[PDB]
Amino acid sequence: MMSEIIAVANQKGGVGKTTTAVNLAASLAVHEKKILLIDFDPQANATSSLGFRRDKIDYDIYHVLIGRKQISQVILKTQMPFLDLVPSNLGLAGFEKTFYDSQDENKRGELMLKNALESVVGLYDYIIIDSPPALGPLTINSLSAAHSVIIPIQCEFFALEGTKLLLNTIRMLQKSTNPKLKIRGFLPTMHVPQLNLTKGVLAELFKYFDSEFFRDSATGEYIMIPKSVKLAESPSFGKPILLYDIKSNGSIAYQKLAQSILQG
Amino acid sequence: MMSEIIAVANQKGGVGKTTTAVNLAASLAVHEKKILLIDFDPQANATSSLGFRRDKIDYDIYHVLIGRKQISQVILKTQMPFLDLVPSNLGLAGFEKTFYDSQDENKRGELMLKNALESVVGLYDYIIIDSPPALGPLTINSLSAAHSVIIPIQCEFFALEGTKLLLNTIRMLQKSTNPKLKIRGFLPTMHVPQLNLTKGVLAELFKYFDSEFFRDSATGEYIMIPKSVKLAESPSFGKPILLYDIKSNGSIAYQKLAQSILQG
Ligand SMILES: Nc1ncnc2c1ncn2[C@@H]1O[C@H](COP(=O)(O)OP(=O)(O)OP(=O)(O)O)[C@@H](O)[C@H]1O
Ligand SMILES: Nc1ncnc2c1ncn2[C@@H]1O[C@H](COP(=O)(O)OP(=O)(O)OP(=O)(O)O)[C@@H](O)[C@H]1O
Ligand SMILES: [Mg+2]
Ligand SMILES: [Mg+2]
Numbered sequence: 001m002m003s004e005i006i007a008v009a010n011q012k013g014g015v016g017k018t019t020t021a022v023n024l025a026a027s028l029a030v031h032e033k034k035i036l037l038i039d040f041d042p043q044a045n046a047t048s049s050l051g052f053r054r055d056k057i058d059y060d061i062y063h064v065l066i067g068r069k070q071i072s073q074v075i076l077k078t079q080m081p082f083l084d085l086v087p088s089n090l091g092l093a094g095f096e097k098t099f100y101d102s103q104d105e106n107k108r109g110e111l112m113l114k115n116a117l118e119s120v121v122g123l124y125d126y127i128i129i130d131s132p133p134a135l136g137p138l139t140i141n142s143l144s145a146a147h148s149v150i151i152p153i154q155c156e157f158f159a160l161e162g163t164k165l166l167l168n169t170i171r172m173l174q175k176s177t178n179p180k181l182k183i184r185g186f187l188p189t190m191h192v193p194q195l196n197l198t199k200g201v202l203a204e205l206f207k208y209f210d211s212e213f214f215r216d217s218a219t220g221e222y223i224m225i226p227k228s229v230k231l232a233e234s235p236s237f238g239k240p241i242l243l244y245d246i247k248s249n250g251s252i253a254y255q256k257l258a259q260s261i262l263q264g
Numbered sequence: 265m266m267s268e269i270i271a272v273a274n275q276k277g278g279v280g281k282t283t284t285a286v287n288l289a290a291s292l293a294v295h296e297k298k299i300l301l302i303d304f305d306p307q308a309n310a311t312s313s314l315g316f317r318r319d320k321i322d323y324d325i326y327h328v329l330i331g332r333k334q335i336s337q338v339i340l341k342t343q344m345p346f347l348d349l350v351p352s353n354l355g356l357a358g359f360e361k362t363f364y365d366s367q368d369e370n371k372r373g374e375l376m377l378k379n380a381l382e383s384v385v386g387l388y389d390y391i392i393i394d395s396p397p398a399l400g401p402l403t404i405n406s407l408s409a410a411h412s413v414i415i416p417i418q419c420e421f422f423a424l425e426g427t428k429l430l431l432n433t434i435r436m437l438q439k440s441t442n443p444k445l446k447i448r449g450f451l452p453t454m455h456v457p458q459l460n461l462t463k464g465v466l467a468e469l470f471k472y473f474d475s476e477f478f479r480d481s482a483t484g485e486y487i488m489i490p491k492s493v494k495l496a497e498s499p500s501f502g503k504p505i506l507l508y509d510i511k512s513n514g515s516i517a518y519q520k521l522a523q524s525i526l527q528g
Binding site: 011012013014015018042043044045048054090093096097100132133134135136154156157158161162165195196197200229232233235236 | 275276277278279306307309312318354357360361364365367396397398399400401418420421422425426429459460461464493496497499500
């Protein structure tokens with residue numbers, strides 16, 4: 001209902017999905033908009049990014065999906081008063097099995113996350129979903145639950161084929177399980193402007209998808225997350241970058257992203 | 265000939281599994297060892313890396329796993345006479361369902377790739393398997409088919425939690441479906457030595473797993489693949505780095521890796 005649910009998705013591995021989900025969630029939360037981050041990857045990197053140890057997590061999103069727990073029972077408060085987390089753990093890897101079992105019986109396996117979110121949509125301004133690297137049941141559940149999708153894009157070769165495919169999947173879902181699903185935007189990540197490869201991949205993407213790239217709401221510039229040493233360091237301190245170095249380039253870029261989201 | 269089957273595996277996305285599988289395969293082939301590269305990711309990045317279009321592949325590894333085709337029917341010659349490829353395609357994403365069906369009926373499924381490889385173990389010196397980013401059915405099959413596993417590691421924060429988890433899976437399989445399974449080695453990838461994060465992560469990894477790291481036997485040095493612009497460029501040209509810039513640091517490093525493999 002009230003919450004805009006935003007999936008951060010891209011089947012390619014290591015393109016900044018988690019970094020984006022975490023830092024966007026934080027960058028929205030610092031405005032005292034109430035944010036819920038869903039770690040929807042069994043590797044649980046978002047969870048770890050916010051300083052939570054895998055060995056310290058009790059019940060997680062998986063338990064909610066299978067009905068062992070209500071989502072209110074697993075929600076954790078973070079260092080930021082307006083950022084809450086539904087953590088992940090290894091047991092989310094069991095989801096696939098569950099999914100297929102669901103499909104065999106009268107159930108809509110693609111909607112399990114959507115259903116799980118039902119009881120908190122009226123309680124948050126934004127729900128941000130960190131998706132895993134594939135187009136399987138988990139990512140399908142993420143996209144099926146979302147109002148909109150942010151696609152982080154690393155400008156290297158595999159990005160070209162990959163983006164097209166993700167778009168295909170999205171359109172599939174638009175014609176089936178989630179008609180209202182929109183692209184919130186493409187977000188270049190780990191961006192190194194002067195590389196020939198970067199320029200080539202970007203130019204190719206602009207040709208088809210110019211209108212999909214995030215724009216700075218004050219200046220009209222394209223929003224891109226620069227490759228940043230500090231950004232890589234941040235999960236090692238268990239904090240979003242804005243909590244300790246708010247003037248760093250990565251922090252600044254993610255805050256521009258949040259402003260863009262807050263406007264609509 | 266009796267193939268050594270080597271899985272390139274790591275559930276983390278974008279850590280150089282594909283770059284490593286492709287370039288190790290090429291680096292072995294130039295020594296007139298007959299290599300079979302198995303693309304075991306539905307995204308088919310290895311396939312694309314060798315100049316094959318996804319939309320142009322007829323039958324792939326998927327069809328072999330489910331018994332529709334014998335593996336000899338899907339093998340493609342590449343630009344290099346000693347390097348053959350079993351290509352992948354999106355339909356490989358259907359394997360999961362099959363796997364779970366199998367687990368449900370007789371608790372089998374882990375050995376489907378192994379079984380598929382039986383008829384070519386006498387025809388190649390090495391079979392290199394490019395694994396997808398997760399610890400699901402595909403990675404389980406890759407590891408269950410292998411003599412040994414190469415674990416590429418990007419030395420950033422998530423490497424710590426991840427590596428331990430991968431070891432757990434390996435141990436599990438060592439206790440179940442694949443007793444002979446060994447770690448061939450850990451391989452730092454996209455390596456930038458002077459970064460504080462890299463130093464910290466490497467120190468922790470040496471602390472627990474020093475003995476697992478790949479070594480150059482001539483110097484005792486740790487083998488690491490340097491971050492390389494040319495390495496990132498090469499798949500865009502459909503070539504292994506040794507065909508694209510044989511004198512580049514990435515090419516040199518992968519040839520060292522091949523030496524480490526060839527020496528035993
Ligand atoms: N803008 C950036 N600058 C420098 N390093 C970054 C940046 N963004 C992400 N990283 C680092 O690159 C690595 C990969 O990022 P990340 O884990 O967020 O991607 P991912 O898409 O979630 O990966 P996966 O597919 O495995 O889920 C991480 O170690 C992360 O810390
Ligand atoms: N040593 C390197 N230097 C520079 N770029 C690299 C290096 N190794 C890999 N890359 C690039 O980083 C990206 C990720 O590498 P790669 O696709 O091989 O990882 P992966 O583990 O196979 O990811 P996935 O889990 O999605 O299959 C690729 O764009 C690749 O070209
Ligand atoms: Mg992630
Ligand atoms: Mg790959």
